[PDB]
Write a protein that binds this ligand. Structure first.
Ligand SMILES: *[C@@H]1O[C@H](CO)[C@@H](O[C@@H]2O[C@H](CO)[C@@H](O)[C@H](O)[C@H]2NC(C)=O)[C@H](O)[C@H]1NC(C)=O
Ligand SMILES: *[C@@H]1O[C@H](CO)[C@@H](O)[C@H](O)[C@H]1NC(C)=O
Lengths: 43, 225, 50
């Protein structure tokens, strides 16, 4: 017959919301943290 | 992420149909391909065949191509294998596995099923015979004692023993199943418990012969002749 | 704006323009009505120079 090549990108079954400037909410593959909210609990 | 639950009868009459199902949890069944894989204990394992988890377009190993028939369901997030005219040798452990979408590619069997034992029922199915084993002077180490619980006369395999329903785990050793001259299967799951606790607690070995649905929280006690 | 055999006409879209205005409306809200409360400042005018 005739061949078809078709491009694309990966996704994740489970993602996380992220705040941007374009859209206050969006879903991306892998998130991280920029705020350490937790302590060991001793000096 | 992705987990699988293997299901089916671990026993089957000779020259009969094998029916198995495995579960999916997380991801979308439509977005991958899935195969099965066979392994008798302590030998080489083998790829059975795969299907379009999206469409249903399939392949099988040439050896089992006629014998093995694999299936899927979009509805229930499940998929099946149907094997006809089974051999006595075909007795093995099975798996459900995630395969890559590409018909030819690498990274095959990225994720595996928990593993379900499948034994052909050569002899009649029967209930476990739970044999307690009292610790003696000659079965106690300085720091430990040897409480035993033999599951004999049980057919077919396996039989999984819980100790205090899995309350104690330290030095609990399930000894492998034994073919006796009886032609019957048996094993003990030995428990090592400190010597200080001797003559104090009456421990329980709990039998989980899953196909027979048997629960035997049988105790081990010292008796005098 | 088309130019066909029949004549010359225009038709508006709703789909793309709705997504347009939508994204603008958010940008308003993310910058409108949002506020901080300040309850006791220090004095900001000085009648005398201490
Ligand atoms: C997602 O990306 C993160 C990048 O932060 C990866 O996380 C790594 O492991 C820890 C805990 O998540 C982080 O503190 C590190 O910054 C990361 N490792 C390094 C040294 O780069 C994570 O591997 C990614 N997750 C997946 C599975 O995609
Ligand atoms: C992702 O995880 C969340 C929280 O467990 C769950 O509610 C959601 O259904 C999951 N989505 C997928 C696609 O697995």
């Amino acid at each position: 017959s005739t061949a078809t090549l078709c491009l694309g990108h990966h996704a994740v079954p489970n993602g996380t919301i992220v705040k941007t400037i374009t859209n206050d909410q969006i879903e991306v593959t892998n998130a991280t943290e920029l705020v350490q909210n937790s302590s060991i609990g001793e000096i | 992420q992705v987990q699988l639950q293997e299901s089916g009868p671990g026993l089957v009459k000779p020259s009969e149909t094998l029916s198995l199902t495995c579960a999916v949890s997380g991801g979308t069944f439509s977005a991958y391909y899935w195969g099965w894989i066979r392994q008798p204990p302590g030998k080489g394992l083998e790829w059975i065949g795969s299907i379009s988890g999206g469409s249903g377009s399939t392949d099988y190993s040439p050896s089992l191509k006629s014998r093995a028939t694999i299936s899927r369901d979009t509805s229930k997030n499940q998929f099946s294998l149907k094997l006809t005219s089974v051999t006595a040798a075909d007795t093995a452990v099975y798996y459900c596995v995630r395969k890559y979408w590409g018909d030819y590619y690498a990274n095959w069997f990225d994720v595996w099923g928990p593993g379900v034992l499948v034994t052909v029922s050569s002899a009649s199915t029967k209930g476990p015979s739970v044999f307690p084993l009292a610790p003696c002077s000659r079965s106690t180490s300085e720091s430990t004692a040897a409480l035993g619980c033999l599951v004999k006369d049980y057919f077919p395999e396996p039989v999984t023993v819980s100790w205090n329903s899995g309350s104690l785990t330290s030095g609990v050793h399930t000894f492998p199943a034994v073919l006796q001259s009886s032609g019957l299967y048996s094993l003990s799951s030995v428990v090592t418990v400190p010597s200080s606790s001797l003559g104090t607690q009456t421990y329980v070995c709990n039998v989980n012969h899953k196909p027979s649905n048997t629960k035997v929280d049988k105790r081990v006690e010292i008796k005098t002749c | 704006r088309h130019q066909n055999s029949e004549g010359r006409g225009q038709a508006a879209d709703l789909k793309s323009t709705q997504a347009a205005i939508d994204q603008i409306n958010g940008k308003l809200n993310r910058l409108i009505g949002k506020t901080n409360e300040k309850f006791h400042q220090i004095e900001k005018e000085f009648s005398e120079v201490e």
